[PDB]
């Protein structure tokens, strides 16, 4: 009963991507061009992964490879967008990308490690530790940096950061409650539906807010 929700996610990502692409044309400043390329590439990768999952690919018997591939690809792009908005140094960005990659890779270790019970909980704990480190990172240095560019930049970055963090904090709960790498409290179809809603949020809503605020970010 999950094909319906996979196709819903597919169509939603497709609409988001087409909308972002139509918004992209006519861009002048190269920074806006970077914003448009990244913000359109994220939902396109998501749509490709969702179409793969919906058409008999994407899942291997016991494992879901398309979701984790999409995550490994797209989460660094969102981090890059946030850092560009805040103007963080390249070293901080490398740190953030490595920490996020470690988080997703730990999540994938739990989806594939299904021998006992404590081993997935340990993988979830360490990946959530990496998540908490990223949370600490986004609230501290990046916010002070964005405020150091200007106050409008600070407010815009705070809105983007609130959206990002609030939406990202729910993925590990879905993971720990689901059937894959979890305890089976919720079924597979509810897991996929909640992932679809979270992806709609984190990819289309964030991109809309970012691309709406480009005029005020330049004038500061
Ligand atoms: C566009 C895709 C997004 C925003 C999804 C990101 C995924 C996560 C933040 C998930 C993180 C996890 C943990 C914090 C620990 C348990 C395993 C994961 C991968 C579900
Ligand atoms: Mg996603
Ligand atoms: Mg998300």
From Swiss-Prot:
Keywords for this protein: Cell membrane, Chromophore, Membrane, Photoreceptor protein, Receptor, Retinal protein, Sensory transduction, Transmembrane, Transmembrane helix
Example of a GO MF term: photoreceptor activity
Pfam families: Bac_rhodopsin
TM helices/strands, residue ranges: 2-22, 40-60, 68-88, 93-113, 121-141, 168-188, 191-211
PROSITE patterns associated with the record: BACTERIAL_OPSIN_1 (PS00950)
Places the protein is found: Cell membrane
PTM: The covalent binding of retinal to the apoprotein, bacterioopsin, generates bacteriorhodopsin.
GO BP: phototransduction
Positions carrying N6-(retinylidene)lysine: 203
Family per similarity comment: Belongs to the archaeal/bacterial/fungal opsin family.
Function: Has no proton-pumping activity but is potentially capable of functioning as a sensory SRII-like protein. The chromophore contains 36.5% all-trans-, 7.6% 11-cis- and 56.4% 13-cis-retinal in the dark and 30.1% 11-cis- and 47.7% 13-cis-retinal upon illumination with >460 nm light.
Protein name: Bacteriorhodopsin-II-like protein
